[PDB]
Design a protein around this ligand. Structure first.
Ligand SMILES: [Mg+2]
Lengths: 210, 346, 211
DNA sequence: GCATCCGTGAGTCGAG
DNA sequence: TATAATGGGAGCTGTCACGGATGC
């Protein structure tokens, strides 16, 4: 009934009191140090649902990843607005990106083993240890690494470089590690007598990255 | 402005769940309930009280109210006591608290997520005696039942199990509400079945079926009398404000006489009756007049036995009944004489 | 983990885990607080800066926000938010009406009455008439909001059997029934802890029922 | 200051 | 109690005669 008495006492326009009573908009009793768009929230301010959700429950957004496309960012790692989350995705806000329902889980298994290799004494560079990528030796002429045991060959080729494991019956009698720059001359499940070339080292040879 | 559009907008705010998100939320809910159970086993508290406390803390102090099923009044004091005793648990035990909270959050997000399905189901129930929004809210109750009863292990989408409970709650509402005079739900079922039967019969016969035809069509136990009594008992009331005319002038209730309050004529005749009876009772002695007056209950409005009037007048029941007899007899003589009291007999 | 035990993925030997190809990516503004020890706050608790969370108080909160406890990632997360109180409906309005101190508003508007502008003087008068009305009356403004809704005596809204043996009744009965139904449904919806967007709808429908 | 919007009024008895 | 089902429809049109509130 105009002029509204409730609206009059509280200094609220018809539209405002309508919005509050009929649940179009929130009205703030105790801002509790709230801030919206840089300005602090004054008591008896009108907030939409977007604004009240942003203020009270915090801001967030989810973005889809097309199937078979890996994320360009890591779980838990901070992001800046505009920074591309993926080749097809650009984040609208700043914050902590989180992974939602990962399709592929890759497990890197730790392996600590022991393997021998024989090299010409002139070519070798003496070192107490070899870090990845570091040069193991330098060979002036093609050299043939020869088998020091007899048995069946287990050949496993890593990302770069490889491993040979010789076994008689079910028990391995040898383990050789072939670093980068050495081409294996044998295949998996092959029989090698002592002295025949397992591989060929040529030119420089270095440790693999893995 | 339009409440329906507004609610459809608010519903349009929360996005729809992928199969993954759905299964995740479901799982979190179930495991949350399990967590509350185990937590009640550990603490020795009531699983209900615990659930209400966890729920309270998730929703905030914005919603705190006493629950009818709870034996304690639920207020921020008591929920703080309980929450603090929950915070005093060892790491492995205090873990179940976090599980519970996660569960509740998952539940809320689940309901809010699936709110659209309720609308899409209830839009088909319009016109059955309930408002669109009422239907929507009842369907929401159904949705809640679905969430609390759902098991993700069956690898079913949420929609399939939800739809059943939603439809059930809506139907229950329609049955329990839309009649001004409430009728039991089974009875409403019988009435609607009677209606479908009658409509089928009218579609085959090309005319409105008689009571006997419907009786025969309803199988055994149903005669014409049963059909008629069922229809009669199903009769809805009519508005007193229904207009009887072209103009705003006539209301139906304006034609309805009040039978309750006595008419001036009836009142005056009752008065003259009391007066004439006092006239004829004064023609007796005060003792016999008082005995008659106590026996017919003119004094207190109730009739005393022979033992009570005999104990009050200090005579035997035979004696008090005897003076009652002679009083009544003298009254019969006086009435045969003056004939004043004959006209009051209708 | 999975539904059926034989579909589970168990780690054969020692190694580290790498997550690839997420179904989606959720970007949230939040502050991360890793923990090695039993955490003192659970999920849902609201927290200001300088609050104890985990590790017996060693790790605290930098910002204002809401606590999400991650047991999987072993980190307490805080989504930046306030405690801000904002309501809707006649409860909020009843609050604002209760909060009003009349004499203060009277005097403020009196100061407003000396202003040169004609319009402002006018509005100040219009308001002051209301304020002074409530003041001199002895009636509290908050009574303009209803808690207990009165019910008209039945005889004044009859349910009566007419000549034919049929019932005729007043519309106030249907209105009262609407009110009572929506109300009770609200009480049960609250008792069961339904989400917002439900309770909101119910409350709105309740107000429209009373109207 | 002057166009514009929203709510509230628009005869009596009779019969119906 | 479990295939899955995820945003509603009808408006309704030849009165002024306005009153006070609201708007460039
Ligand atoms: Mg039969």
């Amino acid at each position: 009934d105009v002029p509204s008495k409730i609206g009059t006492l509280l200094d609220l326009s018809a539209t405002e009191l309508e919005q509050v009573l009929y649940f179009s908009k929130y009205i703030v009793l105790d801002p509790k140090g709230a801030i919206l768009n840089g300005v602090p929230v004054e008591k008896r301010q009108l907030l939409t649902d977007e604004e009240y959700r942003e203020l009270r429950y915090g801001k967030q957004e989810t973005y889809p990843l097309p199937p078979g496309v890996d994320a360009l960012v890591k779980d838990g790692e901070e992001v800046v607005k505009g920074q591309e989350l993926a080749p097809g995705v650009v984040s609208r806000l700043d914050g902590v990106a989180l992974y939602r329902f990962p399709r592929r889980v890759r497990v890197e298994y730790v392996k600590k083993e022991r393997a021998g290799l024989r090299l010409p004494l002139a070519a070798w560079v003496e070192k107490e240890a070899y870090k990845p990528g570091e040069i193991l030796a330098e060979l002036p002429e093609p050299y043939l690494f020869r088998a020091e045991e007899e048995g069946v060959v287990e050949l496993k080729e890593l990302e770069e470089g490889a491993f040979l494991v010789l076994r008689r019956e079910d028990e391995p009698v040898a383990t050789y590690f072939l670093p980068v720059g050495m081409t294996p001359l044998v295949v998996h499940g092959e029989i090698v007598e002592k002295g025949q070339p397992l591989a060929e080292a040529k030119g420089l040879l270095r440790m693999p990255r893995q | 402005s339009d409440p329906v559009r507004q609610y459809l907008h608010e519903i349009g705010q929360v996005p729809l769940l992928t199969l993954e998100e759905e299964v995740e939320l479901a799982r979190k809910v179930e495991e949350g309930m399990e967590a509350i159970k185990k937590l009640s086993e550990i603490t020795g508290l009531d699983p209900d009280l615990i659930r209400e406390v966890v729920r309270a803390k998730i929703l905030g102090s914005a919603r705190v109210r006493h629950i009818p099923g709870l034996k304690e009044t639920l207020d921020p004091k008591t929920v703080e006591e309980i929450d603090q005793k929950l915070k005093s648990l060892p790491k492995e035990h205090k873990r179940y608290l976090h599980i519970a909270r996660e569960g509740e959050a998952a539940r809320q997000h689940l309901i809010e997520a699936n709110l659209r399905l309720v609308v899409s189901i209830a839009k088909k129930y319009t016109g059955r005696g309930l408002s669109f929004l009422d239907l929507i809210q009842e369907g929401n109750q159904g949705l809640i039942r679905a969430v609390e009863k759902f098991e993700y292990k069956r690898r079913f989408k949420f929609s399939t199990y939800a739809t059943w409970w939603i439809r059930q709650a809506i139907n229950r509402a329609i049955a329990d509400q839309a009649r001004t005079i409430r009728i039991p739900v089974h009875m409403v079922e019988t009435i609607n079945k009677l209606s479908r039967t009658a409509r089928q019969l009218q579609q085959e016969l090309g005319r409105e079926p008689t009571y006997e035809e419907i009786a025969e069509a309803m199988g055994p136990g149903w005669d014409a009398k049963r059909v008629e009594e069922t229809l009669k008992i199903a009769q809805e009331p009519v508005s007193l404000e229904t207009p009887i005319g072209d103009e705003k002038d006539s209301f139906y209730g304006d034609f309805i006489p009040d039978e309750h309050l006595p008419s001036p004529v009836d009142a005056a005749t009752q008065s003259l009756l009391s007066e004439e009876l006092e006239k004829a009772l004064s023609k007796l002695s005060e003792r016999e007049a008082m005995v008659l007056k106590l026996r017919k209950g003119l004094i207190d409005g109730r009739e005393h036995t022979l033992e009570e009037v005999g104990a009050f007048f200090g005579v035997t029941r035979e004696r008090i009944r005897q003076i009652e007899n002679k009083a009544l007899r003298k009254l019969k003589y006086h009435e045969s004489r003056t004939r004043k009291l004959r006209d009051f007999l209708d | 983990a999975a539904i059926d035990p034989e579909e589970e993925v168990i780690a054969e030997a020692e190694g580290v885990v790498h997550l690839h190809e997420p179904a989606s990516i959720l970007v949230v503004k939040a502050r991360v607080y890793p923990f090695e020890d039993d955490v003192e706050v659970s999920t849902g608790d609201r927290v200001a800066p300088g609050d104890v969370l985990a590790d017996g108080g060693k790790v605290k909160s930098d910002v204002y926000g809401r606590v999400e406890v991650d047991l999987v990632r072993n980190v307490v997360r805080v989504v930046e938010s306030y405690d801000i109180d904002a309501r809707m409906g006649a409860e909020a309005i009843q609050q604002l009406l209760k909060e009003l101190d009349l004499e203060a508003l009277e005097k403020e508007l009196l100061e407003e009455m000396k202003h040169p502008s004609r319009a402002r003087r006018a509005k100040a008068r219009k308001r002051l008439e209301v304020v002074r009305a409530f003041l001199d009356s002895g009636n509290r403004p908050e009574w303009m909001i209803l808690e207990a809704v009165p019910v008209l005596p039945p005889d004044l809204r009859p349910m009566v059997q007419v000549d034919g043996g049929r019932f005729a009744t007043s519309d106030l009965n249907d209105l009262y029934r609407r009110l009572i139904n929506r109300n009770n449904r609200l009480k049960k919806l609250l008792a069961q802890g339904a989400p917002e967007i439900i309770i909101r709808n119910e409350k709105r429908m309740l107000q429209e029922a009373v109207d």
